[PDB]
Design a protein around this nucleic acid. Sequence first.
RNA 1: UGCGUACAUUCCUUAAUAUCUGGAACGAUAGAUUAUGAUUAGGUAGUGGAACAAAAAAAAAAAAAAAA
RNA 2: GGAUGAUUGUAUAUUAGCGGCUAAAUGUCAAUCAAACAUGCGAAUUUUAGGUUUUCCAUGAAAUCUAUUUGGAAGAAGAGGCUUGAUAG
RNA 3: AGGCGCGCAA
RNA 4: UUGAUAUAAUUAUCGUACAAGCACUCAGCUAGUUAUUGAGAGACACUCACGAGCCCAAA
RNA 5: CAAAACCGGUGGUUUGUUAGUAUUUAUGUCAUCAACAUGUCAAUGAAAUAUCAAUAACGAUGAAACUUAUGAUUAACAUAACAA
RNA 6: AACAGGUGCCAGGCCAACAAGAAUCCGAUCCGUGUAUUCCGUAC
RNA 7: UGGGAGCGAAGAUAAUCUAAUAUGUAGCUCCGUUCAUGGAAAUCAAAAGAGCUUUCACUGAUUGUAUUUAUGAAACGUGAAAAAAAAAAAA
RNA 8: UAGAUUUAUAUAAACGGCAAAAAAAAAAAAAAA
RNA 9: UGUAACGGUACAAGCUGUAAACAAAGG
RNA 10: CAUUGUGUUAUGGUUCUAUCGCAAACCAUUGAGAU
Lengths: 228, 182, 200, 46, 113, 149, 61
Amino acid sequence: SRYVKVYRKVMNLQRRKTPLPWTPTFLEFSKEPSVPFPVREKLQPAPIDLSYYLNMEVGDLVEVLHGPDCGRQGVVLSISKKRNTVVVDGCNMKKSFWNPGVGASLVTQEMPIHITNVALLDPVVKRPTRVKRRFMMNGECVRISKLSGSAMPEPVSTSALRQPNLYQEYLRQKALGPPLKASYARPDPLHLKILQRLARHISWGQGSPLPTAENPRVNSPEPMALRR
Amino acid sequence: KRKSKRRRGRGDKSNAKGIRWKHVHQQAGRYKGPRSRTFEGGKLPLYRRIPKWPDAWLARQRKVLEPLNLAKLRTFIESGRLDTRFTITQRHLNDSRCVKVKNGVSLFNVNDYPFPYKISIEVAGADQSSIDAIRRVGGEVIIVYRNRLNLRAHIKPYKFEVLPKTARPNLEMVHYLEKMRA
Amino acid sequence: KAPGKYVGVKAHPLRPHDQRIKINKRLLWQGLKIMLSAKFAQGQITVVDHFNLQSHKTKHCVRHLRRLLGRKCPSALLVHEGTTDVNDNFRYATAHILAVRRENVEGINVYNLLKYRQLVITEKALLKLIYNIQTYPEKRGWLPKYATPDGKPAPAPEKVEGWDREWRQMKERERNAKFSKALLRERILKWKWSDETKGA
Amino acid sequence: HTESTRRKQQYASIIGKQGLSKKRCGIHWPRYRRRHKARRATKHKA
Amino acid sequence: YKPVIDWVKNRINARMRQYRKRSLKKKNHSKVIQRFKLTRFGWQRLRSGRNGEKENLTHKQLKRTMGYTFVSRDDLWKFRFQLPSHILRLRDAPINRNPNIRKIRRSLPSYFG
Amino acid sequence: QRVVQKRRHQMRILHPAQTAYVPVEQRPPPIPHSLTASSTVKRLLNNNTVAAKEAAKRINWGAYISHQRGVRWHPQGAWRVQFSRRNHERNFFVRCECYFRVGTYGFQMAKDLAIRYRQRLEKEWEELQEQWTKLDILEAEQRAKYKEK
Amino acid sequence: MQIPRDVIFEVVRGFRGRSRNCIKIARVRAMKALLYSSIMRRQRQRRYRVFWIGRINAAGR
RNA sequence: UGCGUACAUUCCUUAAUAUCUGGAACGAUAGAUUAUGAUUAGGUAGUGGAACAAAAAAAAAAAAAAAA
RNA sequence: GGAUGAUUGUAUAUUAGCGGCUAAAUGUCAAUCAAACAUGCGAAUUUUAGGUUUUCCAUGAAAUCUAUUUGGAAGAAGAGGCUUGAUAG
RNA sequence: AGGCGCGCAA
RNA sequence: UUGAUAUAAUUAUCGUACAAGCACUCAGCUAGUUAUUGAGAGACACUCACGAGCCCAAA
RNA sequence: CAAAACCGGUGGUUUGUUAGUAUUUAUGUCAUCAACAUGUCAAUGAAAUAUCAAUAACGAUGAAACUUAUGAUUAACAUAACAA
RNA sequence: AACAGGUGCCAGGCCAACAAGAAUCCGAUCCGUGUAUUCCGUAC
RNA sequence: UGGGAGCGAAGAUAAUCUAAUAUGUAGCUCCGUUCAUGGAAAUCAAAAGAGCUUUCACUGAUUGUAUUUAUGAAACGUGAAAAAAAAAAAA
RNA sequence: UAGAUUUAUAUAAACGGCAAAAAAAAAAAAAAA
RNA sequence: UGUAACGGUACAAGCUGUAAACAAAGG
RNA sequence: CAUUGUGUUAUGGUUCUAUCGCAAACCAUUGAGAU
């Protein structure tokens, strides 16, 4: 069929983050105005943060309900309220990349799971449950699970949960660029300092001759001077 | 002064193209006749009257060399676009834009006119008149066999990390090379 | 719902489309040169040492602009290179002067030059612009090349003596012109029109 | 047609007068305001 | 009830149509192309009767029949639409009515101006 | 493919005629183009024949040449005198369309009178320009005197 | 239109009934009125001339 | 031996765009308009030239006489 | 006209359109049934035929020929070519 | 990258 | 008033026809749209740029 | 031949001043289904926290009123007043 | 000139908790965010 | 979902009509869209070479199929985008 | 996140043969989705 | 999730659930 | 050149638009946090 190509083009226009940045160059003008914008329906349900109403916090034990990790149990490490997504320990191991540090050639790590695909676990029955916040007379808050009526254990602490995020380090290094030459990366502090002194003279010398063994005198820079 | 728009059907006195003949004396429908490019009536189309000509449509399919006139070559030499102290090659012609090489340059002379300069030139082909005119003043015409990849590497070696080794010709190209040598 | 039967239904409706057109880059280059010439002729060009400021206050920059251009200037385009011709103090000061617009040398257009009445250009940016304008034809390939390692023309060789003597003699013979039909028949026998569209 | 002719005549009658008000301009108020803004545009930075 | 418009679909379809329309190409007639050859002096064609009965033709007529000829000027408008990618730019003789280029100018002491 | 059709004749590609440059120290003035509007001259030029070519040599084309700007020949059978000027500041627009007819005066006498007419018009124009400059200076003097008060 | 709308409504002043204010009928009536004027303005010269002729004939007789 | 009768580029005002009306002329800081220059100017289909269509946008709505 | 009978009447059901039912009339299937109606970015077409909206000006046809079943479709023919101003005052 | 054109004279 | 004078309009048609079709009247809606694609081919098709050269796609 | 980020919080820009708007039932059908009813939530007014006084007249408020303010707006079309 | 909202209508300096004019003159009948002139704030 | 899978028409072009086009389209059922499709050669090519897969432009409306109508993002190739192969014998 | 929060929307599928009644003894019993 | 039926609330195109618009001052 | 008509004006008839809204993208800042 002779329409698949144009259909794919117009559909990619729906995902394009137009306008994209464009570097000016002499006698060249951007095509961004000619690129059309994506079309969307603006009358939709308002944003919500489902974690607030579900009483789900980092450090809670949850079970993945659907997908290739069905039945797997892990501790929540991160919650995105805007995306209503959750990172679960050892689940959705989808993001693999060249190792930015020491160890094996490749490293893989979790990816967010939508909060609706996950459920809190009852401490006694260990099945999907619903957690409600109750308040005592003094104002102490207690999270109670529907299935057994048990109080939720305190979330695992950030100190225990912490792990480095190697994908962000990989992204940082990639943004920096390809690896440097070993010779270029070798430090040369003495010659660098010589060049830095020369650069100081070049930038702030106002075109005075460089010092020599014959005349090492110090040339006084001129001030801007007021108009009179 | 630009051109005024000539929208139709906006009054009787407008100088736009008329509508009355179109309405009354023209066939109705999208195509105003049969949907075709060949129809001329009940009679056969001219092309179907005429017999088929396989040579005509095989000539188009034949792969052809880029022609270069010795007059153009002379003008470039005189203006200095090519250096006659060294062998002038297809790459030199391409880079001076005397001729852009796709399959190879072929020299042709006009009216058996003489050539004034002694030159050594490598090309893919050349007419007998061009060869005689070049050699009459001490010149030299060279033909180096090159496959498509070899010609690409000869014109644009800078696109190759490892240059390829020239390949041997087939029977047709051996015939052509020996004919050129003759 | 059909044309002539419902309000909002059209036979030839307006359609979304791209309004951009095409123009020859050579025409754009020539237009830039003409715009610079026009600004010089009409006295709407000023050359500045640099746009480096020691204060970020808008009022000081406004006073400098008023001193240079007067109190009746409609608008100005401030052209600089970006690195050592201007500084962040200037970028801060000009950020709220709605009558002036900052541009780099890469973004100079006939449109900008026409839109903004005055053109205030640093010497560095002016030289950068002149270089770009003068070297554009070479970059776009509008000038001849010489197929030499240096890229400059090579010496023109001399002609081999007697290279056209036979042709001259043949012309001298034919110039009698009394055997016209005989020569015509000889040419008809010798030569053949080609049926190809390219070449001889 | 008649409506367009009438609207054009009224616009020609009002658009050329400075200092009008919203109640005087009616349906032509945004057009009149834009026209006066354009006329002022030349006074900026004198 | 109101007739609400599906702008997403309408605009997507409009963009698709626009892109296709502005990327359309030329088209030639694969059958018409096979009977003709374009040369520097005009379109050429074979002669009907080449493949027919010819026992009653003389030698002159047979030579002409097996030769070739040019497409008549009356049939060129067909090519404009059947073979768009192959254009023959017609070149008639120049028509210049300036009296100074005429042979009678040699009998005048000057030109007309 | 944009193939330019070519014409061949006698084993050569036919081209439009084209002549070389013949330097001339002083090219003489042309015979007026107004003569080509006459029926006799039009037929002479349109008939490429021996009789036309002999009548061309018998015709005295030099008598129609005017050595005066603004005076020349008209198919009327008269000498046309023209003089056009536009002065917006003084609101003065002049267009002379004078005719000196051969039937009325004579070929040569009409020519002479037309030439004299054009010369007088030029002289009057010069004098008027001088007077306008003088009057303008006087007007400036009056305006300055008024502003003195 | 053959005649401008304003001219039509100005010419149909003083006419009878709908011809004064309805464009469809006013157009036809104004067309006829101006056509009659065009023809009769060309014709009236000889109608005046015959009147002069008759007056002169009576005076001479 | 007469006369009636239809026709005015006689007067006055406009127009001419598929290369031949003077004009390849006279002007020229952007054409003022030809006074005994010519042809002339009914028109369906078709074709062509010009003038409007009161709006919007644009970074050009004060160097303008006299009066204020 | 029938009115102890192939009678009349009644709740809820069955047969569905490239079809059903039909003591057979192309009768009837929600009153246009020789093949129901609703919906369909299946976004039906038309050698006939209805309309097609400012003005001024320049130029200006034909109802003919070939061939095809075609007052249709194809080609040709059909204009702008040229001229129309003069003194032995 | 590619496209068109590239004298038939001298 | 009186004298003279004049067979609404539109379309098709050989045919300037209310025994031909539409229209009470009026308001608004209501029909030659567009070559990032084609072109000047003896029934008409302009205009700038560079010039033996000219253009510069995706990015 | 010149020049050389991740998860929360807070605002702004663009989409979009250049584009459009979509949530409730009156009415049809056996049903599938079809289909922009009724101006606006709103007397008028910027303000009613300006509608007071009052059988009537003169008064009050208001820029404008017992009213071209105690709903506005063509033509066709409806009625009057004045005029030779 | 998009130096956003509101204030009787077009307000950078009247309100809007962090800058800056109750600025002056001229306005048929009330008002003016209007015309003209001018001062001030602005890394907004 | 003019993306992918299954089944699968006619009105329209061919001036009737058949093929072909429409079109592998509409309706119907099922996937649910870059965390996807697909995929690291028993590949393509020439006697030189390229190097999984994917996207864009050119080659080109070319070579093709249809042989009255039309269809055809062909293959190799060229210029770009993106770049990846495979943590992994247990602990 | 102080509490409370009726009824309908035919749901053992947070689950696994298909197949009426969200899942019905074997067989009869039949499938392009 | 979304929607609706009834009920309460100015007998309603709003809000709301028999606690039907409000607890924030508890061993 | 009517009191059965016309001219001029007036009063009716008449289309109804008052933002109850504004990222899922990008820019700039700022906490926690990693290096």
